[PDB]
Amino acid sequence: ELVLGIDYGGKYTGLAVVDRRHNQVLYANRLKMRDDVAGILKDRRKQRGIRRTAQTKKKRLRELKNYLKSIGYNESTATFETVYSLAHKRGYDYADMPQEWEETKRNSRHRKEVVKDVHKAMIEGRATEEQIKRVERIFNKQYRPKRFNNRILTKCKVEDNTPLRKNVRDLLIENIVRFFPIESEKDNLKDAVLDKNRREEVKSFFRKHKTDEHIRKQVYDIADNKLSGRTVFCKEHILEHTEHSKEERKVFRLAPSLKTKIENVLAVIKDEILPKFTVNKVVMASIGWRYMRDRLRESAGNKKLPIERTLHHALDAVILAIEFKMDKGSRGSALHDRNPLSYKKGIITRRFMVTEIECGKEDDVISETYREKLKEAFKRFDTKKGKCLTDKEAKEAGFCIKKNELVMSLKCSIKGTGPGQMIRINNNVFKTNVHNVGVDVYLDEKGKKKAYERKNPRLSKHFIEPPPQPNGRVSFTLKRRDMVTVEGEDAIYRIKKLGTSPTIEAVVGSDGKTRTVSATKLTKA
RNA sequence: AGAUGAGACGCGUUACAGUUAAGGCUCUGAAAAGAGCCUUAAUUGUAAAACGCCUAUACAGUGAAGGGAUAUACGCUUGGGUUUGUCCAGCCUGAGCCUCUAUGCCAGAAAUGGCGCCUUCAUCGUGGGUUAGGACA
DNA sequence: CGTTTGTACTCCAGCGTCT
DNA sequence: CTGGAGTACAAACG
């Protein structure tokens, strides 16, 4: 009777297979699932916000340019230049201008100031009030509509859509007063909490009946405070927690960033259990728990498989009855770095703030005088190795403090970057870490066995360096993270870094050390 | 005790062009030094920030009329684009519908009204959606 | 003897406030 | 962070 145990946890997960008829342990290990982080969806959303904001800005500039060319203010006129230069800084409008407003922000102005400047610029440009109000509407116009009321939806519950806490507050406060020792005052406290004209009499209850502080905190939270978040209300479990009618509805995939680690568990399950073992019962309810149950009954080839509810994690897995994951080379990941690099005359350069460079990077700056002032300022202050300069250290200023804030910028040269990583998209130049997708081994003439890199097809028309390939017969092609053997060696090796002579790793028994062997001497396992 | 999602505000980066300041080099002058080129920094303007894939039976603007909780959609059901070697998440969207979910701003105590918004028509144009994230090959 | 690949070493990567 | 860059150093085949 083979039993599979899942010790699912947050950072680590134990896996074990035990035969319960003899207490014989046949398989056990522990692992992590989390990649680098699955919170790079936050950086994806930040880039999505930057991209959509830039698209909206380009869209509005296009529309306002079209309208002003329709009126007659061509790009030669000073009126067009004045209003069109103002359109790049609209100013915020969520906060209405009236000491507090001046101490709030020091840049971006405000929408009313900007549109007052538009009124001034167009009354200097002989415009009518119709044209001025149309330009005012173009500045105030929304292009991508603000739809953020019910976007994500906690859904209908067979156990464990749903409405906001904003709209069903009466049910929550009733759930608070459900466990009170007084009956006739329940509806009175209901009328007291929900009415803002009856706010004062609620505080009498906490001294009259000596309730717990948690109860008082909950009542004050319901008192027009906890307005955010969705409750669990649906057609079922409106007010109760009855566990009847199991498996009434299907299960959907609404739990983002948890699928990643659940299928990371199921990857080693599929790779190490199903080809070799047959399990009669699996033991590990939450949405992820239900999803994981459905995925094991999908993968095991049995829709009715019984699934029921740091070496100590592996021990707990054995009682219930190494290996890290990481990736950035997939098709879903970033082609190239976010901040573009200057690539002139074969020299790779980037501006940086003076306040960012630290003591370990003394002599990378191009300009000599500011380099010297940087190192004397390093010895002037306590800013030793690894510390970036502060604004208080910027109070002893560098040359020509900026108009907007007390910093200064210098060019610098970037190491760890070569001509093979350069791609140019439009006018920009970025570096990439996905530029190799495979190693093509060629043999030609008398048997000259040599290898080339397969450049990435998505970027192949954008590389600055032409892709070197002479003619030959392609006999072999490797990819990243493959199993590979070495000519003249008995062990099995795995590729960590590829290109020319790929960097290969021991599949077992390594201690962090690496070794390189050319792809000519290489063959898969 | 966190989840992912919508929309902006800005700072940073890159390209091209302009102005100013400092330094170096070169030509010339009788000389003071005049001029030209380069470098670095400040500042100003414009443009780019996935590659791509799909869409013109689409998208967008203007004008008129009607509707607007009895209704619409950020909702439900079922399809489509992103989509690929295969399946998805997220976002956008076609048709029908209101079981679940949500419904903005101004005024009027309030009933309610006016804006935003949706639909139809006319006219004008080329624009629009999604792409830095996963999993199995 | 004169090249030619394999090894250590150092370094590289967008960031704030709001509703 | 992972996938890779340049750079100084070394031992081996042609």
Numbering used by the authors: 4 to 101, 125 to 186, 190 to 212, 214 to 314, 448 to 472, 494 to 505, 540 to 743
Task: Quote the authors verbatim.
To understand Cas9d rearrangements required for cleavage, we collected a cryo-EM dataset on the Cas9d binary (enzyme:sgRNA) complex, which yielded two distinct structures. We resolved both the Cas9d binary complex and a partial ternary complex in which 6-bps of the R-loop are formed between the sgRNA and co-purified native nucleic acid (referred as the seed conformation) both at ~3.4 Å resolution. We could clearly resolve the RuvC domain in the seed conformation but not in the binary or post-cleavage states. Comparison between the binary and seed states show that a REC2 region (residues 95–136) is repositioned to an upward, open conformation to allow the R-loop to propagate to completion. We also observed that F174 in the Cas9d seed complex caps the R-loop between positions 6 and 7, akin to Y450 in SpCas9. During the formation of the 20-bp R-loop from the seed complex, REC3 is displaced by ~20 Å to accommodate the bent DNA:RNA duplex and is accompanied by a ~ 5 Å rearrangement of the sgRNA P2 and P4 regions towards REC2, allowing REC3 to position itself in the active cleavage conformation. The sgRNA P2-P4 rearrangement seems to be analogous to the REC2 rearrangement from the 8nt to 10nt conformations of Sp.Cas9, in which REC2 widens to allow REC3 to position itself for PAM distal R-loop recognition. This along with the previously mentioned REC2 and REC3 rearrangements suggest that the seed sequence of Cas9d is bipartite, similarly to what has been reported for Sp.Cas9.
